[PDB]
């Protein structure tokens with residue numbers, strides 16, 4: 001039913017977060033921002049307040065089609081330290097649902113807490129050394145179909161990442177229609193249009 | 200002294216444009232103040248994301264800042280165009296010799312419609328190109344018109360380029376390149392940052 005869960009924490013990368021939410025809303029998805037902890041507002045890495053609509057403990061995977069995890073170093077660490085967040089990764093993945101993560105999160109959450117063991121993934125370049133060398137992708141956006149896992153690198157790949165999520169969940173045609181107004185760099189747009197064909 | 204940037208927000212402001220601007224400028228060590236149009240400090244962005252301002256726009260003065268950065272969003276830009284305070288503030292910044300920057304809907308729905316930066320080259324979102332006199336329209340992703348200290352840009356996908364250009368103009372290309380370095384820009388998005 002085109003429902004996306006976007007956890008946020010103190011220290012989450014706010015432009016990554018908002019790019020994800022906004023882009024998915026443009027695609028007609030119902031996006032829920034859910035806070036780690038017991039305060040619904042959390043302060044992003046660069047001071048921007050992120051106002052969630054519910055707490056992460058109130059979330060259950062059957063209410064969503066996909067999980068999208070922002071980066072930021074402090075935010076990724078907060079995710080890694082959250083019992084509920086780690087459990088949601090397990091729940092989504094064991095329901096066969098797309099899990100998507102960007103920036104520090106694949107390194108500081110997945111690699112550190114044994115999530116998506118054996119999956120190809122990328123992350124922020126400053127954390128490449130956290131990923132097993134034989135599994136590391138240097139793609140700006142990396143999809144690993146076997147474990148329904150989408151990863152990406154940083155603030156400057158966030159739009160590409162969110163559009164790839166749309167392509168996977170709802171088809172490249174909708175992703176292309178959502179991308180056109182956004183004034184992507186021509187290279188970004190070309191790579192989106194070819195993204196599903198490349199699978 | 201660290202550069203001070205005013206970022207007005209309104210109901211319907213484009214939240215990814217807004218947050219890209221704020222985050223990127225904070226990465227440069229700048230002091231960034233979000234200020235809300237209307238009587239509430241929290242305003243809902245175009246795609247539902249709540250933006251929490253620190254203070255009211257209507258009590259801001261240009262004297263307290265080094266530059267003004269205006270997000271887009273159709274509803275937000277319309278709110279800006281309907282705000283006497285916002286319009287007078289644009290002129291105060293310009294007449295104090297300061298950079299005024301705007302992206303997407305705003306150069307069309309605010310500057311062109313409310314007769315700001317007459318004579319200036321500017322860009323805007325492609326869907327508003329018809330609002331800009333043909334002899335002044337730039338189709339550049341980022342357009343700087345130095346005579347009037349005016350920086351404009353096109354859309355969500357140009358917002359990072361736009362904010363980096365602001366850093367370059369205010370504090371030098373070295374700082375802009377340092378801020379850009381870890382952010383995983385597409386390599387081709389970084390080729391003209393060199394020359395602001």
Ligand SMILES: [Cl-]
Nearest residue numbers: 245272273274
């Ligand atoms: Cl809009």
Ligand SMILES: [Cl-]
Nearest residue numbers: 154155381382
């Ligand atoms: Cl970064």
Ligand code: NA
Nearest residue numbers: 235237255256
């Ligand atoms: Na106000």
